[PDB]
Design a protein around this ligand. Structure first.
Ligand SMILES: [Mg+2]
Ligand SMILES: [Mg+2]
Ligand SMILES: [Mg+2]
Ligand SMILES: [Mg+2]
Ligand SMILES: [Mg+2]
Ligand SMILES: [Mg+2]
Ligand SMILES: [Mg+2]
Ligand SMILES: [Mg+2]
Ligand SMILES: [Mg+2]
Ligand SMILES: [Mg+2]
Ligand SMILES: [Mg+2]
Ligand SMILES: [Mg+2]
Ligand SMILES: [Mg+2]
Ligand SMILES: [Mg+2]
Ligand SMILES: [Mg+2]
Ligand SMILES: [Mg+2]
Ligand SMILES: [Mg+2]
Ligand SMILES: [Mg+2]
Ligand SMILES: [Mg+2]
Ligand SMILES: [Mg+2]
Ligand SMILES: [Mg+2]
Ligand SMILES: [Mg+2]
Ligand SMILES: [Mg+2]
Ligand SMILES: [Mg+2]
Ligand SMILES: [Mg+2]
Ligand SMILES: [Mg+2]
Ligand SMILES: [Mg+2]
Ligand SMILES: [Mg+2]
Ligand SMILES: [Mg+2]
Ligand SMILES: [Mg+2]
Ligand SMILES: [Mg+2]
Ligand SMILES: [Mg+2]
Ligand SMILES: [Mg+2]
Ligand SMILES: [Mg+2]
Ligand SMILES: [Mg+2]
Ligand SMILES: [Mg+2]
Ligand SMILES: [Mg+2]
Ligand SMILES: [Mg+2]
Ligand SMILES: [Mg+2]
Ligand SMILES: [Mg+2]
Ligand SMILES: [Mg+2]
Ligand SMILES: [Mg+2]
Ligand SMILES: [Mg+2]
Ligand SMILES: [Mg+2]
Ligand SMILES: [Mg+2]
Ligand SMILES: [Mg+2]
Ligand SMILES: [Mg+2]
Ligand SMILES: [Mg+2]
Lengths: 169, 290
RNA sequence: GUGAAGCGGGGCGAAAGCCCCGUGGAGGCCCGAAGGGGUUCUGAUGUGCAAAUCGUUCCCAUGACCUGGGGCUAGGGGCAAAAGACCAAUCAAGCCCGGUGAUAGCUGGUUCCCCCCGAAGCGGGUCUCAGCCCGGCCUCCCCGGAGGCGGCCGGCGGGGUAGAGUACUGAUCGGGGCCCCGGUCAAACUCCGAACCUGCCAGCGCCGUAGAAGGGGGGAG
RNA sequence: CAAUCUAAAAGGGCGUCCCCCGCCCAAGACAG
RNA sequence: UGAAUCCUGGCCACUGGCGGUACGUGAACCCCGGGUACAACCGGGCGAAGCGCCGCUGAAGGCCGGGGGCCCUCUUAAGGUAGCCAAAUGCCUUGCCGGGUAAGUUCCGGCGUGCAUGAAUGGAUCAACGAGGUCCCCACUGUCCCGGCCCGGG
RNA sequence: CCCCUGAAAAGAUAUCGGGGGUGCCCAAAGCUCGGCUCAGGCGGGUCAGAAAUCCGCCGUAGAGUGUAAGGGCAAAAGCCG
RNA sequence: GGGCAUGACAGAAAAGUUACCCUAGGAAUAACCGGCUCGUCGCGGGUGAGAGUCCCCAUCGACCCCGCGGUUUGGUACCCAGACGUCGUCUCUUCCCAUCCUGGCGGUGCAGCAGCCGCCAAGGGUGGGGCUGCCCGCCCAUUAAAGGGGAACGUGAGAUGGGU
RNA sequence: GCCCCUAACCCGGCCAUAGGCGCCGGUGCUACACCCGGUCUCAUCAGAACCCGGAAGUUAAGGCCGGCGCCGCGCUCGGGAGUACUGGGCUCCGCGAGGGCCCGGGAAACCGGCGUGCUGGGAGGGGGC
């Protein structure tokens, strides 16, 4: 994988129609909603924290997965799976491309340089706008310090600056 | 005890390839122990996987005097889980037309690789839905199949990019009469280097009298010089399990199909064999008696 | 210098024979002057002594040896123990003069002054891509004869982009009982839908009888 | 005192200037 | 092809050459018919070499792999024999093990499913010879440690 | 050569840009007239079955229309005569 | 008027090879250096799963993310084809610091002897051999240590010429 | 003949405010139907349909009219919102991708409210010329 700065900016149209894309990669995020997901038990939670994007850009699938792991592990350890609801709010629909010389990927991929430059699929990313919610947490007011810490850890894994907004439901 | 899950077919290659392995060393490894997919590790003392390469990657060599390492040509691996079923992984291999995949456990630790050879062997212990080659075989008249048909006297430069790029899994080589002279796959190019000729960018010719600064290819090898000769051919009434046994054993994924006079009318690919074992006959086809 | 065949003597010995010494004077034999050649220093020289030399170190030196004079073989031809060598400082095909001022879409050059207007690298075709032709764009002249439009307002029309949506075709995360609710998306999705551009008419504005529209002709770049 | 033109990020800092909110103190708050 | 010496394997499919009864094909001439008051023209017959076809030929140009059970079998015929080798021929590769050095990517001796060795395409092979290419040992030294002084000409 | 996208709501619009297709096929798959309604679902019905023919209800096209893609089409542009 | 065809489809009838090569030109166009870029390469930082007896941060640092340099390789084709001498080494000088030793300081899972890690610091030192044309690297005996880079990949009108 | 007014019927335009589901009523001299038959024209497996000949029965159904509810749909209405987006200018900000200011335009979803066919010609009926 290239450094994430290579795919951070929105430089072209969304590339999502998988029926026209050969070898589009499979999404490598196993779950998107963590903790207590049933709507009845979520009624106990009365606070909402959001990790909100500050800039527009593309977040790679592995960064979303890395952010999801660190925050969910922290909440499981310190808050408890029965006392919170955490949702990864964006889905990596956009397919990333790379122009590299490769074997077993088509004859055109054997031409070097910028000849036949249209890249083969290299991964997935979510295209986000300023103010967009990346992570969404529902919790009880007693755990505010722990929820803020979990979202601070998630933010350290993401390629764009974010900010934490805490509001009641 | 028929294998059903990926964990029953995971294989470990006899050789270890890192990002610093050269393409010449990689070709030497595959000469001795042919495998369908090679995991590439970040270092000698780490089991972390930097990516995968295919046997086709060894054929990207341009010159024996030019440095070329495996780490410069890493493919994005197709990743499956050890708990998945054999049929499901076979579907993904058909979808991507890839000869293998990397197997990881629940936490993403590298377990091993799974290949077309392994799946074919595992399905060998079962009963094909369709039993005859006629039910699942690619005709010679198809527009863009995964098998090529080439004359024995053709130059290898004509078909080289289609093989290395993976647009076909192999070639059926025809004699003057349209019979099967032999089979050509990437393994022919890995076993022998009679086809190879070094190239490169123009040399730094300054301050001297040198009249040929760039190497040029002049005598190009013909296909029959490096093809596999004497392969067994199949008939429409040939059992599909004999074809499957061959492909599983030798890792050659193309078998010619001939009519009663020996004229080639198509081929059976490893994708055709999987289709028989997974679904049955192709649309508009009937299973003839074996 | 070595010392072949051949020829003497002596010694040992049963025979054959073997050994020592001499004689003899063979060889595309050896060392080495003359002579011939041309390896090294990658020495000197490198506007030289010289358009190939000099020093040094070397190779052969009775022979398939070196050398004088005379003779023969001539150019698509000769001659070659073969390097495509050599054939008068010329050779993957000599030289002289002629065809001949060969052709060159390529490169170089192309000589006085002022005044008027003033480009182009776009489209199409081309064995076409360093060229050329037909249009666009420039200029000059003539015909013609009253309308014209890089701007704006209005009337009457067209459109499906931004956004929006997730309703058709697809993708996608959750909740609840194949349905309902919430959420994430779409270059090759669209119920909606701007700004904006554009057609006709009327007006405004400006240009136009010191000549609009339109047409013909010369020269282009 | 714009651009060509020679620069800077994630992150850390009550370093310092400032704005807002919550709570305690009704002189029985904070610090010993 | 390249002294001598021990040797020189299997293959005639291919590319060539040569031989051949019959058969197919195969030009002009010639013959027959139609046509033309004559011709042009149209059809047929006959039919040489050659080609097709069948054989021979590798000290002709050369080639010498798989699968299966010494046997069968596939591909353009056969299926690399005697030997020889990390070769002036081995990419991987500074191959592996010994020798030699304090330390040897070179060299020497072995090993060999040899990327891609091999028999007059000559194989093996070093007596004698070598301004051929290479490694080791003794001697030797201003090559060097590390530079100094002197002589002739610039 | 052809369709969609790129293409920026008139027109034009390029890249060894993206996704595909073409060198055919059909005496019907061509012309016209009439009748009819498709995919799928449900209820009933002898073999009979998920699927055959029969009766009924629902069914906006979820079918079909030779062949790419896009567009069009329901007393039809589909199906039968 | 219909057909027989040019698919390179606005229509020639057409195979190689040159390292023996020759001519016209081209920076409209490659190779070296330079310019731009930095994926790659090298170096730094955030994060802290997990390891460390206990203990995230003595020492590390999965999954991810932000950067710097111009030192490997590539991308591009801006300058140079009436020509900027093409690898390495020798010789000689200077500069950088992201410091191997020497000077200062701190931490340590620092008893001592040693070791490991960070910070300041570029004044001086960083050597001799074996192997290979090398560069790089491996190795030998020492050593306080036997650092790494830039200068038209410093330096062929200075040499050398083993490789290419 | 002519002009005016006016149900259900005939021929239309726009093609859901017209469609869909459920419930409650109205309409029958005439008109529209359901309805009665199959000799004749015509028709099929089938007088079901089509076609022909009728007038016993009925407003049960269709048609047309009125009301209520839900779905769907419509609106030059309120909010959403001068928001999103956007034509022109800028030595205005930001490291940068990008944002901001000024002049000129200006949505959509959705929420609420309202609406649930309108209309042209003709016959028939009524009034006058
Ligand atoms: Mg872009
Ligand atoms: Mg040349
Ligand atoms: Mg002699
Ligand atoms: Mg020399
Ligand atoms: Mg010299
Ligand atoms: Mg001189
Ligand atoms: Mg001599
Ligand atoms: Mg030659
Ligand atoms: Mg000549
Ligand atoms: Mg000539
Ligand atoms: Mg002349
Ligand atoms: Mg002017
Ligand atoms: Mg020019
Ligand atoms: Mg207007
Ligand atoms: Mg949009
Ligand atoms: Mg959206
Ligand atoms: Mg437009
Ligand atoms: Mg940045
Ligand atoms: Mg032989
Ligand atoms: Mg052998
Ligand atoms: Mg030998
Ligand atoms: Mg060998
Ligand atoms: Mg050797
Ligand atoms: Mg051989
Ligand atoms: Mg030989
Ligand atoms: Mg040979
Ligand atoms: Mg020999
Ligand atoms: Mg000699
Ligand atoms: Mg348009
Ligand atoms: Mg058609
Ligand atoms: Mg019809
Ligand atoms: Mg053309
Ligand atoms: Mg230079
Ligand atoms: Mg360059
Ligand atoms: Mg890196
Ligand atoms: Mg940390
Ligand atoms: Mg560079
Ligand atoms: Mg240029
Ligand atoms: Mg320049
Ligand atoms: Mg110059
Ligand atoms: Mg110079
Ligand atoms: Mg010069
Ligand atoms: Mg420092
Ligand atoms: Mg240099
Ligand atoms: Mg020089
Ligand atoms: Mg110089
Ligand atoms: Mg040399
Ligand atoms: Mg050499």
């Amino acid at each position: 994988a290239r450094p994430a700065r290579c795919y951070r900016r929105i430089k072209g149209p969304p590339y999502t129609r998988e029926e026209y894309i050969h070898g589009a990669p499979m999404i490598q995020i196993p779950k998107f909603d963590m903790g207590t997901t049933s709507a009845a038990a979520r009624a106990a939670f009365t606070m909402v924290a959001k990790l909100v994007a500050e800039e527009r850009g593309q977040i790679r699938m592995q960064a979303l997965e890395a952010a999801r792991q660190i925050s969910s592990k922290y909440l499981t350890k310190y808050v408890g799976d029965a006392n919170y609801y955490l949702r990864l709010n964006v889905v990596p629909h956009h397919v990333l491309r790379e122009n590299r010389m490769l074997a077993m990927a088509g004859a055109d991929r054997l031409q070097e340089g910028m000849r036949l430059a249209f890249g083969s699929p290299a991964g997935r990313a979510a295209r986000v706008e300023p103010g967009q919610v990346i992570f969404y947490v529902e919790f009880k007011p007693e755990h505010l310090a722990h929820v803020k810490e979990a979202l601070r850890r998630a933010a350290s894994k993401l390629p764009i600056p974010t900010r934490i907004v805490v509001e009641p439901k | 005890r028929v294998p059903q899950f990926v964990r029953d077919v995971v294989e470990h290659p006899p050789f270890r390839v890192t990002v610093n392995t050269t393409l010449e060393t990689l070709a030497a490894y595959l000469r001795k122990f042919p495998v369908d997919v090679v995991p590439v590790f970040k270092s000698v003392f780490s089991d972390e996987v930097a990516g995968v390469v295919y046997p086709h990657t060894a054929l990207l060599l341009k010159s024996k005097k030019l440095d070329a390492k495996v780490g410069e040509f890493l493919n994005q691996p197709l990743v499956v889980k050890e708990s998945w079923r054999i049929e499901n992984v076979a579907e993904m291999l058909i979808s991507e037309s890839k000869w293998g995949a990397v197997v990881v456990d629940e936490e993403g630790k590298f377990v091993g690789v799974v290949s077309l050879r392994g799946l074919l062997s595992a399905l060998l212990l079962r009963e094909p839905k369709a039993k005859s080659v006629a039910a699942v075989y690619t005709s010679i008249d198809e527009k863009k199949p995964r098998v090529g048909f080439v004359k024995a006297i053709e130059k290898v430069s004509k078909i080289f990019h289609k093989l290395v790029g993976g647009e076909v899994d192999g070639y059926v080589v025809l004699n003057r009469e349209g019979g099967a002279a032999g089979i050509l796959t990437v393994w022919n190019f890995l076993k022998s280097r009679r086809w190879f000729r070094g190239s490169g960018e123009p040399r730094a010719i300054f301050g001297t009298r040198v009249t040929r600064g760039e190497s040029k290819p002049r005598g190009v090898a013909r296909v029959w010089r490096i093809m596999s000769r004497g392969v067994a051919v199949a008939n429409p009434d040939t059992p599909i399990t004999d074809v499957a046994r061959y492909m599983a054993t030798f890792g050659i994924y193309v078998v010619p199909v001939v009519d009663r006079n020996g004229k080639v009318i198509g081929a059976v690919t490893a994708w055709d064999v999987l289709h028989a074992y997974l679904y049955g006959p192709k649309e508009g086809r009937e299973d003839v008696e074996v």
